[PDB]
Amino acid sequence: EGKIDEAADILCELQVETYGSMEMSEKIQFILEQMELSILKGDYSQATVLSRKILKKTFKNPKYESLKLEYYNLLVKISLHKREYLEVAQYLQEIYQTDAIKSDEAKWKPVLSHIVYFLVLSPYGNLQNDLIHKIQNDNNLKKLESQESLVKLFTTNELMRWPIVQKTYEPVLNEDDLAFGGEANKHHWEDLQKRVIEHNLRVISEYYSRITLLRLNELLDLTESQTETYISDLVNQGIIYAKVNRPAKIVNFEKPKNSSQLLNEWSHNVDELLEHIETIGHLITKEEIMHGL
Amino acid sequence: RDRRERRLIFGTIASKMSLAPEADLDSLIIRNDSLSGAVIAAIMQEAGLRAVRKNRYVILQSDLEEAYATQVKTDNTVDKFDFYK
Amino acid sequence: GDELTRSHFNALYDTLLESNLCKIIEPFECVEISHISKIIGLDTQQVEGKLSQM
């Protein structure tokens, strides 16, 4: 009949008070479908609350076929209103081992590209280094080595070829009809461009100690007003800290002076001469044997 | 106690809990009369027990009404049949 | 018209400004004053007068 809000409100006002927790076969299946009605309705809070009930109970239950596949789709669909690529990357850790054990490489290869998509677009995290090696990688695959190089690309990326890379290969990048939704590709360019700038300034600080602000603007592919936006965001959120001088046009790493000088840093001067007494100990034994005989 | 004077207790505990925009906090300070801070603390905690019973992490207006129905007993007496005379 | 309201008006005037002052102080200092007044949104003389008072 063309009803959206009315179709969702019927099941939400019934299924909650219906089941007495007797048969979980039809209950779990319809709750997963109840979240689908909230997707068409546009309520992210309804699906978020329903995802805190049977999700933990399913973990204790054994793995099924049609039941487990519904969790992987809904956790991606709830990212429309959430727009967080870090949380979905943790939700895809179960399907990563599911397609590599239960299923075959036919469905495992495309999902591998999706997992990288949520990792590249993730703002930050402590698991990003653990997701570089993963488990099943080094499988000698073109799609596996291409997506893996994009993870380590953030270090050497100058943002010169960034628009070129997405146009040449666009599996998850520009045109993606799987695990994504929207009316245009603007969500692909806006979300990816903001991340590659944040991930770029992280390695630049770890390498360049003091760099000119004029040369720095050319590496970010931004302007004077655009460069100050990403710098103020990383410092206010507690990501990185550096020195920015507008009149001097000099960017510095802001090395901490709290090391107490010779109370700490002097430990590097003793290690300069420390290895001598060890190497001499190995040489005294070896020199007398070969030269004497 | 007083209706608006008890708000410093009911409202303070409400600030440490998650509430809904439709939750009515005035209904707790009307019918309730002369409650200690310990009994009041059990009112807001009972509203949270009604929220987890409904599998919700936000206390609604109905949870505040269901919490009062349990707290109607303050002094120790048998039902409404006390005070024999 | 109220003296108590105006007394708290300058309290929030310095409170909302302090929230805006903490925005420029969070990044590294030694920047241009002309760019400071553009971020806060007030005149150069007004920003220098209230900031030096704190």
Swiss-Prot record, chain A:
Q: Which UniProt keywords apply?
A: Acetylation, Proteasome
Q: Where is the PCI domain?
A: 84-258
Superkingdom of the organism of origin = Eukaryota
An annotated GO cellular component: cytoplasm
Q: Name one GO biological process term.
A: proteasome-mediated ubiquitin-dependent protein catabolic process
Concerning PTM, the database record says: N-acetylated by NAT1.
Q: What else is known?
A: Present with 5710 molecules/cell in log phase SD medium.
Job of this protein: Acts as a regulatory subunit of the 26S proteasome which is involved in the ATP-dependent degradation of ubiquitinated proteins.
Q: According to its UniProt record, which protein family does this protein belong to? A: Belongs to the proteasome subunit p55 family.
- Specify the protein name: 26S proteasome regulatory subunit RPN5
UniProtKB/Swiss-Prot annotation, chain B:
Reading the lineage from the top rank, the first entry is Eukaryota
**Which residues are in coiled coils?**
none
Q: How is it modified after translation?
A: N-acetylated by NAT3.
Tell me where it resides. Cytoplasm; Nucleus
The similarity annotation says: Belongs to the AAA ATPase family.
Job description of the protein: The 26S proteasome is involved in the ATP-dependent degradation of ubiquitinated proteins. The regulatory (or ATPase) complex confers ATP dependency and substrate specificity to the 26S complex.
Q: What is this protein called?
A: 26S proteasome regulatory subunit 6B homolog
Q: Which organism is it from?
A: Saccharomyces cerevisiae (strain ATCC 204508 / S288c)
Q: What is the lineage of its organism?
A: Eukaryota, Fungi, Dikarya, Ascomycota, Saccharomycotina
As recorded in Swiss-Prot or TrEMBL, the protein's gene is named RPT3
From Swiss-Prot, chain C:
| Entry PTM | N-acetylated by NAT1.
- Taking the record's annotation, the residue ranges forming a coiled coil are none
Listed under subunit, the entry gives:
Component of the lid subcomplex of the 19S proteasome regulatory particle complex (also named PA700 complex). The 26S proteasome consists of a 20S proteasome core and two 19S regulatory subunits.
Q: What does this protein do?
A: Component of the lid subcomplex of the 26S proteasome, a multiprotein complex involved in the ATP-dependent degradation of ubiquitinated proteins. In the complex, RPN6 is required for proteasome assembly.
Q: What else is known?
A: Present with 16800 molecules/cell in log phase SD medium.
Q: Which family does it belong to?
A: Belongs to the proteasome subunit S9 family.
Supply the name of the protein: 26S proteasome regulatory subunit RPN6
Q: Which gene encodes it?
A: RPN6
Q: Which residues of the full protein are shown?
A: 327 to 380 of 434
